[PDB]
Design a protein around this nucleic acid. Sequence first.
RNA 1: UAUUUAAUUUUUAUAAUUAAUAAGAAAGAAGAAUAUAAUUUA
RNA 2: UAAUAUUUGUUUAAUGAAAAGUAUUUUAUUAUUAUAUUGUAUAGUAUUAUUAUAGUGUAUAGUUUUUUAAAAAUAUAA
Lengths: 35, 82, 97, 91, 17, 107, 227, 61, 214
Amino acid sequence: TNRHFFVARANAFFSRLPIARVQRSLAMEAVREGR
Amino acid sequence: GRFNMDEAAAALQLNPAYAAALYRPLNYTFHIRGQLYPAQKGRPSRPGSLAASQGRMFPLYQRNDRLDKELFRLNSRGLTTE
Amino acid sequence: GIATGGRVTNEDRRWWLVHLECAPDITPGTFIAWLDCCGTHTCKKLIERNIWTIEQVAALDSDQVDELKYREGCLKMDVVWEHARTIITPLRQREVT
Amino acid sequence: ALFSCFRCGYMYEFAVSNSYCRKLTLRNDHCPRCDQLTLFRFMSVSGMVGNMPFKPIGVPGPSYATLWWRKTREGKEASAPLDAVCKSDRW
Amino acid sequence: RKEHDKALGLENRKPFV
Amino acid sequence: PAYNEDVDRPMVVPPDAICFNCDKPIDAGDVNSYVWIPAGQGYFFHFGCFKCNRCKYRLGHNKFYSKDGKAWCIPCALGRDVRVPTRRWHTSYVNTHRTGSRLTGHF
Amino acid sequence: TTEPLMADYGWTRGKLPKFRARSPFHRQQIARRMVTEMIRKDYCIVGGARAPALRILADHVVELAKAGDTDSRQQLAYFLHDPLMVDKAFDEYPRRFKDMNAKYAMMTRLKSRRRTDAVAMYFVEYKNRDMSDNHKGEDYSAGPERFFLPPRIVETEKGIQRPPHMQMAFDRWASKFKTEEFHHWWRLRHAKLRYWGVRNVPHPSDVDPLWTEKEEEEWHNEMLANT
Amino acid sequence: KRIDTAKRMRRDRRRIEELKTLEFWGWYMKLQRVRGRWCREQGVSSRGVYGPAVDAAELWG
Amino acid sequence: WQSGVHTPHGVVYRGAKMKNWPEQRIPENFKFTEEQRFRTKAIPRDVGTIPRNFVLGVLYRHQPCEVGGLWEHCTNDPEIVLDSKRHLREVLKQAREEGFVTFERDAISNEWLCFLTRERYEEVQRIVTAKSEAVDTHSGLRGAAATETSTYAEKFREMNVEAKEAHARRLEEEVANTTRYLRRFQQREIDYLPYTDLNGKVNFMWWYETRDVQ
RNA sequence: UAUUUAAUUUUUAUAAUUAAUAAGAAAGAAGAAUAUAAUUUA
RNA sequence: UAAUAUUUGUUUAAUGAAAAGUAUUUUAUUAUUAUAUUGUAUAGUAUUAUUAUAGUGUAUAGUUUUUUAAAAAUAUAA
Ligand SMILES: [Zn+2]
Ligand SMILES: [Zn+2]
Ligand SMILES: [Zn+2]
């Protein structure tokens, strides 16, 4: 399937969200409740 | 201060025509069968060109019988029981 | 911490302070190579500046820092610098008792 | 690779890469014992240079000869005389 | 001039292109 | 097995080695002219000197006898006078400098 | 594989591209002679998936050169067919690249392709050469005359001197092309290629030599003109 | 005759190959002595973009 | 080589330094964490002809030698080319390999001792002597007062007549103090550059000089 | 090789009123290639 | 059929070679110690084929023509 919604990808914009920050944030929330 | 095979042979007393014959195949010095390339063989003179022989275009690959008779085939006077 | 972009947020500080107690034996006189984002090249250029120490990297005037990361070129320098800035005081505290 | 010259049999070792494959059996190098250029032979195989991903580096395993040579040198009995000076992990 | 004359009075770095 | 692992024994050639048949010295390492036979005892022959000292012919199948420090061939050591080879006379089949002996020897 | 020499040749983006060869051993051999040649002579005209490989590998060599470590020296020494070029690699590149951290090698796609096959040609260079000791003013727009001569120098840069240990090596290497047995090798090569037959290879009686003495006495002349 | 010839040819090329080699090692050591001389005035440490202190530590050396 | 880290503080190995090698004062808060203690990769050292000749030249002046106390004998000379106890140790390793040195325990006490091998002992005699015949030509005291040279040689050959032994133990301390006093003015600079051989091994070329301070 | 099926004809902003069980400027590498859409770079 | 299959010349240890019954050596060439006379290089199997057959004799001449920028399935090996 060759359409535009499917082919186009958002990789280039990934700096707009802090992936590494949220992972560590939920690490904090992991140790806060003690899993 | 390079190698200079001639002065290397002169230092070793190796007969400088021989020393060079160590580093080319036995086809090019001694009478021995060997792979020859037909372009080396030589060509008769065309109207455009001159003659082509393997005397002028390959002096250093031609056979020397000084070396051949002194190395390979036997002397007769060593065997003469007469 | 390690992978943060741009400015270092305060939350990120919390991370470092958490991992302070993660490693039981640490002193402000520890070698540079225990820091986040201190590579080979980043350690070496600090050494020729006569800096072996977490205290010593916490002693930087920030115009030593930038020419460390611009004129010289140890990248991610402000990360390790700031990493010192945070952690040097708690370390002294844990050193006393 | 373990190398010894023909004349004094001076033993030493260095890794041989894939670039040097034509030099593996015979070397020419300077001996400390007879000082001048000599000719070295390959007695025993030791180790690779490179290793493939997700594979141990330490198993082209060097032979018993080389490990004997690193027992006799650099061993309990070999270091014990020298430990009074250096104890090589220390300066 | 005065500096080569000091050098000469006592009597490499960038090659001349 | 290949490449005898020689760490325990240097296997260097002594310059004071002389020929076992002709009692003349050996040019040490620079030439393959000498046939060296390690017994895993050094035995040094010249190339021309590998032959028998009794009949002066080749040593068959490269196995020999030695009496009074001089090498004899087995037919000449077994008390037999039948003497002449078919193939060649005054040289030997041997491979120079230990390469014939390195096949099977002390490892 | 994250180690800045050892190569991973795949097609996935984490891996640098595999250029076609017989074996990964063969790929390594090829890569090694490419890197050796590029370190010896700053540019390589290189076709195919080979050139990006050369780019990345050259960047790795400059990284090792900046390391300036005995382990780095040794690991680069494992990699090259030339020991001498390793010394060149640790003398030149640090001063050359001291102001740059990233992308040390320039790749330029050429608009000409091999006649032999459709594969494109890339021109791979080291970057800034005005900081280099032996490559200081050289012109690569066209080749030198006979390929054992030192390459073209820009008109404004003529008077440049090079590290003596390099032109010693270069002259020693170039001095075996003036002996007549090379000329015999040349004619005999004509014979060979003509036999295997390859078109447009003249008969060995038409092949007049690369090196004569008149041409040498003018070449050395202009060479001391550059000196 | 040809046994002797076959060894006569294989001994002396072995002889002169060393003459290639010893002069080549002589030359390479001449070369490296040239590097030894030249890298002094230019101030080349050949140890990287790092100053003497870096290697002086010897932790990285 | 830095006195604070590689070794306990306040220690100075006395010997020749390396050119442009700074001594940078390390604060003592200092320690590695336990997994960083195993890093420690030494720069290789010169095991070549010169330091071998020097350590031999020392090992000749005392036929038995205490391994543990050798460093100070080494430092005792005006001629030191050597850096750390490490540098010494390696030189002894390869000197052991060359067959110039055999290690024997004498044990009565725990002492470990160096013997110059009976096989190579000729060579060493050449080496020492050769050193002795060069430096007397380069000593600035000669060709000024010849009475000094004669008063020195005559008295030594006449002192060797009764007991020359005590004269030596009396002599070497003036050597130690002369060396220690001279060290304030001038140091021996060890200069090094790396190269690669034909077999493709990285090894260093060395040369030594002496720079003056005042 | 013919039929027959399956895939493709190289980003279609979008999808399904029914059949049966869907298509906007163009080719080198889709990567300037060692997973950042430039890590400052002469 | 066929814009098809094939070919595709980026790195040599084929050292050696009498038994080949074809290949313009323009003068291939002793300086001999010997006598006259005669003769020395690449074509086996329709090929510059997979690659020869055999008898010499020897061990460091590296003794120097194999294309290519994704994935299936086929062929090897892990
Ligand atoms: Zn030796
Ligand atoms: Zn004999
Ligand atoms: Zn017999």
